[PDB]
Each structure stands twice: as structure tokens, then as C-alpha cells.
Amino acid sequence: STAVQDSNGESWNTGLSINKGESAYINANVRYYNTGTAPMYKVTPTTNLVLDGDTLSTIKAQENQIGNNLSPGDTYPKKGLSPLALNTMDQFSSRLIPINYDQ
Amino acid sequence: EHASTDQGKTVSRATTNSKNSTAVQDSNGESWNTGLSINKGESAYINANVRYYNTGTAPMYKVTPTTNLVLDGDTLSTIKAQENQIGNNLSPGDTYPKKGLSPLALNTMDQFSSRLIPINYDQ
Amino acid sequence: EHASTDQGKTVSRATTNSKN
Amino acid sequence: LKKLDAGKQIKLETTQVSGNFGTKNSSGQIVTEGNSWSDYISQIDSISASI
Amino acid sequence: LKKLDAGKQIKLETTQVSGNFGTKNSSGQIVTEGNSWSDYISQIDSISASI
Numbered sequence: 552s553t554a555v556q557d558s559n560g561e562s563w564n565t566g567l568s569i570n571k572g573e574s575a576y577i578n579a580n581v582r583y584y585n586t587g588t589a590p591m592y593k594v595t596p597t598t599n600l601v602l603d604g605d606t607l608s609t610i611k612a613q614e615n616q617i618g619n620n621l622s623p624g625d626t627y628p629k630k631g632l633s634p635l636a637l638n639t640m641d642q643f644s645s646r647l648i649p650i651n652y653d654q
Numbered sequence: 655e656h657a658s659t660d661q662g663k664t665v666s667r668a669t670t671n672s673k674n675s676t677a678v679q680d681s682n683g684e685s686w687n688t689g690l691s692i693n694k695g696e697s698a699y700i701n702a703n704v705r706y707y708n709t710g711t712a713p714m715y716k717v718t719p720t721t722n723l724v725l726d727g728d729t730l731s732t733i734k735a736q737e738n739q740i741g742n743n744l745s746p747g748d749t750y751p752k753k754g755l756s757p758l759a760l761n762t763m764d765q766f767s768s769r770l771i772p773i774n775y776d777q
Numbered sequence: 778e779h780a781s782t783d784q785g786k787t788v789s790r791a792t793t794n795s796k797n
Numbered sequence: 798l799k800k801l802d803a804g805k806q807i808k809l810e811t812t813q814v815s816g817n818f819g820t821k822n823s824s825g826q827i828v829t830e831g832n833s834w835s836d837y838i839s840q841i842d843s844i845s846a847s848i
Numbered sequence: 849l850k851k852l853d854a855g856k857q858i859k860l861e862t863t864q865v866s867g868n869f870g871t872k873n874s875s876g877q878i879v880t881e882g883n884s885w886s887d888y889i890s891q892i893d894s895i896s897a898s899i
Binding site for chain 3 (some may be wrong): 686
């Protein structure tokens with residue numbers, strides 16, 4: 552008894568992998584203003600991101616968000632432009648703010 | 655951790671010819687896979703919400719504390735506020751986050767604020 | 778170490794016709 | 798990326814600029830170091846009008 | 849990469865150059881530090897003609 556068996560097969564696979572510790576990144580669009588009496592040179596703020604009652608993280612503007620000049624009654628991104636981005640976390644501007652799956 | 659979800663759809667068609675006797679077989683197949691991967695040295699990360707206060711007689715500039723995180727009798731780690739947790743000014747009788755704001759976060763561990771505090775599976 | 782746990786569920790159907 | 802490929806355009810704005818200027822020390826050399834124009838931007842903009 | 853392998857030629861163009869020059873201090877020692885030609889390039893090109 553002889554037999555010849557031919558076979559054709561197609562396969563489609565989809566896969567989603569996710570880490571639940573660095574489940575997402577965030578960036579902010581913010582803008583500095585001044586209301587005192589004197590101009591401020593090389594402005595750099597330390598700010599807190601807080602979600603509900605838990606402070607998400609503390610960020611200090613390292614090098615790409617330092618306002619060179621702030622005159623009284625004027626914003627750093629002078630009116631007409633767009634706000635500035637705040638994403639990096641570490642000192643040498645190479646990191647992004649992580650948030651886990653629950654947050 | 656690392657959670658992976660996989661879906662698979664397979665379609666097969668085969669033809670057998672023996673001697674006579676012919677046969678055609680069609681096949682459909684569905685697969686669902688879940689996968690949880692974990693380490694054992696960096697099994698979790700921690701971040702603290704803390705607040706500095708002053709009770710002396712003089713103000714303190716550029717405040718930076720070295721603090722110990724201890725679990726039961728084992729000092730988990732020692733952390734020094736590197737650059738994002740340095741209190742510029744501390745007047746007597748006043749906290750560093752002025753009353754009304756939220757506490758500050760202590761997560762980074764290395765000098766250039768790029769690391770997270772790891773804890774293993776037993777801890 | 779590195780510990781992985783995998784679970785899998787497969788459902789298959791097939792139809793054969795020979796000659797009937 | 799999908800918004801970029803759909804047809805939306807992306808723009809660049811010059812938020813600020815920094816750079817030094819050149820002065821003279823006791824000798825004839827021109828020195829440009831620690832002479833940031835940012836030290837005078839605010840005052841010049843405050844006490845003058847633009848044409 | 850496909851454009852490179854197709855036959856297109858890639859060119860390199862010098863944009864700028866930075867370098868020091870040598871002066872003499874009180875001693876006979878030649879000093880080349882913080883003496884960037886960039887301090888004089890603009891003025892020399894401004895007040896002179898090239899041949």
C-alpha cells in the first residue's frame with residue numbers, strides 16, 4: 552500500500568507584551584510666569600507631580616527647561632509661543648518619568 | 655514583571671492519495687497563551703513620600719539628608735538626596751514643602767538620579 | 778534568577794472527507 | 798506617528814538663544830568667556846523700543 | 849541604506865573649524881589655551897577682502 556500526503560498550512564500570530572512597572576511614560580506642557588518686582592536669571596524650578604494624594608515624582612529642570620530670563624509680568628515662553636515640555640528626569644537629560652500599571 | 659498575551663490562528667489543508675483512495679482534510683486552530691515572567695533580585699521597586707522639618711534656632715541652606723530605609727532589622731538601603739530632593743532653604747519651625755503642598759518623592763538611588771531602589775522576592 | 782510561568786489553551790477542529 | 802503620517806505638519810519655534818560677546822582685557826586679545834548676552838536681554842528689552 | 853546601495857553618492861562638507869593660536873607669556877613659554885581663532889574670524893572676514 553502506497554500513499555502520498557501533501558499539506559499546506561497558514562498561521563497568523565499576534566502578541567502584546569507589557570511591563571507592569573514602567574507601564575507608561577508621561578510628559579508635561581508647562582509655562583513659567585513672574586509676578587514679583589525684579590527679573591530672575593537662569594530660572595530653574597523644582598516641581599512635584601502628584602496624582603491623587605501620592606506625589607508621583609519630583610523633577611528639577613536640568614538643562615532643556617531652564618529659563619534664561621524672566622522679566623516681571625512676563626512668561627518665559629513669551630506670549631505667542633507654545634508651552635515647554637517636561638519629560639526627562641535624571642540629571643543628564645536621559646530618562647523618562649515612569650508610571651506603573653495601577654497608576 | 656512582564657506580562658505577555660498571544661493569540662494564534664492556524665488553517666491547514668491536506669490531501670492524501672493511497673493505493674485507490676483519496677482524502678481531503680481541512681483544519682482550523684485557535685490558541686490563547688498567557689505568560690508571566692519575573693526576576694528575583696530586582697523583584698520590586700519602592701519610592702517614599704517624605705518631608706523635611708526644622709526645629710533648631712538657625713536656618714539651613716542646601717539641606718541634604720542621608721537616610722536609612724530598614725524593613726525589620728535589616729537596613730534595606732542608605733540614600734542621600736542627590737539633586738531632586740535638596741531643600742534650598744529651611745527656616746526654623748517650617749517644613750521644606752511649605753504647609754499646603756504635598757510631600758516629596760525619594761525614589762532614585764545612584765548619584766546622577768538614574769536608578770530605582772530594588773528589593774528582592776523575599777523582601 | 779528568571780522565573781517564567783506560561784499557560785496555554787488550544788482549540789482545534791478538523792473535517793476529513795475520503796472516497797465515501 | 799500616525800498623526801504625522803496622516804498629513805499633519807510639525808513646526809519649530811525658537812524659544813530662546815544664548816551666546817557670548819567679545820571684550821578686551823589689558824592686552825590686545827579679544828576674550829569671549831562668561832560674557833553671556835542673557836545678562837542684558839531683559840534690561841535692553843525693558844528700557845528700549847523695537848523698530 | 850537603499851539609496852546608498854542604489855548608486856547615490858554621499859558627500860561631506862566642512863561647516864566650521866575651531867582651534868587655538870600661540871602667544872608668549874612673561875617667560876619664553878608658548879601658550880595655547882583659551883586662544884580660540886573663533887574670537888577673530890568674524891572681525892577678520894568683516895574688515896578684509898579675500899584673494
